[PDB]
Amino acid sequence: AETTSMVSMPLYAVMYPVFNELERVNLSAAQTLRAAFIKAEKENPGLTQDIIMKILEKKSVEVNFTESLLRMAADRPEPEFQDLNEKARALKQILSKIPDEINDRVRFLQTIKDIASAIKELLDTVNNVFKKYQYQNRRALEHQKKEFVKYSKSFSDTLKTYFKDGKAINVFVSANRLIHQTNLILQTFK
C-alpha cells in the first residue's frame, strides 16, 4: 500500500497543512492549488521538494519585501483627536524605520526605547479620549485598546525572541501587525 516515493514527502508534510488551513479562507483556491501540486507531483516525483527549496533560497527576496511593506505602513479637528492622530503617527513612523535600524545594535536599542515611549504616549492619549466618550458604545474602545496592547505585547515578545534568534523577518512582520492595530484604534472612532 506504499508506492509513493520518499521525495514526495514535502507535499504532505509542508503543502497539505498549508492547503488545509487555506480551505477555511478560500475553499476554491485551496483545492485548485492542492490539485495543481498533486498533478505535478504525481507526474514528476520530486517537484514539490525542489519548489519548496527554491522558495527557501529566495528568503532574502521575502525579507526585502517584508521590509518595504513595513516602511510603507507609516504613510475631526477636535483637540483630543488631533492628539490621537499625532501619537499614532509617531509610533507608526518609528516602527517603519526598523528595517534600516536593526542592523546597528546600538541604534536599534534606542529605537526599541523610542517604540516603548511612543506606545506609552499613544496609550495615554487613548486613555484621554477614553475619559470623554462617556460609554457611547465605549465597549468597542476598551476592545480595540486591548487588541492593540495584545499585539504590543506580542511585539515585545517578538523582540525578546529576536535577541536570541536573530530572525529579523519576524520583527518586521510583528511590527507590521502593530501598525495595522494602530490604524484599527484610529478607525474604531466611527
Ligand X SMILES: O=P(O)(O)O[C@H]1[C@H](O)[C@@H](OP(=O)(O)O)[C@H](OP(=O)(O)O)[C@@H](OP(=O)(O)O)[C@H]1O
By CB under 8 A, how many residues form the interface with its own copies? 45
Backbone angles phi, psi at 20, to 5 degrees: -60, -40
The alpha carbon of residue 19 and the mean position of all alpha carbons in its chain are separated, in whole angstroms, by 20
Contact 73, 176 (CB under 8 A): yes
Q: Which of 39, 120, 138, 143 binds its own copies (CB under 8 A)?
A: 39
CA–CA gap between residue 34 and residue 14 (Å, rounded): 12
C-alpha cell at 21: 488551513
Q: What is the 3-state secondary structure (H, E, C) of 47-102?
A: HHHHHHHHHHHCHHHHHHHHHHHHHHCCCCCCHHHHHHHHHHHHHHHHHHCHHHCC
Helix (H, G, I), strand (E, B) or coil at 165: helix
Please report how close the Cβ of residue 103 comes to its own copies at its closest, in angstroms: 17
C-alpha cell at 49: 521538494
Please report how close the Cβ of residue 172 comes to ligand X at its closest, in angstroms: 8
Closer residue to ligand X, CB minimum distance, 12 or 65: 65
Going residue by residue from 110 to 149, which x/- string records binding to its own copies, judged by CB under 8 A?
A: ----------------------------------------
Interacting stretch for its own copies, rule CB under 8 A, among 28-36, 86-94, 109-117, 125-133? 28-36
Q: At what angle do helices 139-165 and 168-188 cross, to 10 degrees?
A: 170
CA–CA gap between residue 180 and residue 175 (Å, rounded): 9
The alpha carbon of residue 169 and the mean position of all alpha carbons in its chain are separated, in whole angstroms, by 10
Q: Contacts with ligand X in 141-170 (CB under 6 A)?
A: 166-169
Q: Contacts with its own copies in 62-91 (CB under 8 A)?
A: 62, 65-66, 68-69, 72
Residue 79 binding target from ligand X, its own copies, none, CB below 5 to 8 Å by type = none
Please report how close the Cβ of residue 165 comes to ligand X at its closest, in angstroms: 6
Chain contacts with its own copies (rule: CB under 8 A): 6-7, 9-10, 13-14, 17-18, 21-22, 25-26, 28-29, 32-33, 35-37, 39-40, 43-44, 46-47, 49, 51-59, 61-62, 65-66, 68-69, 72, 169, 173, 180
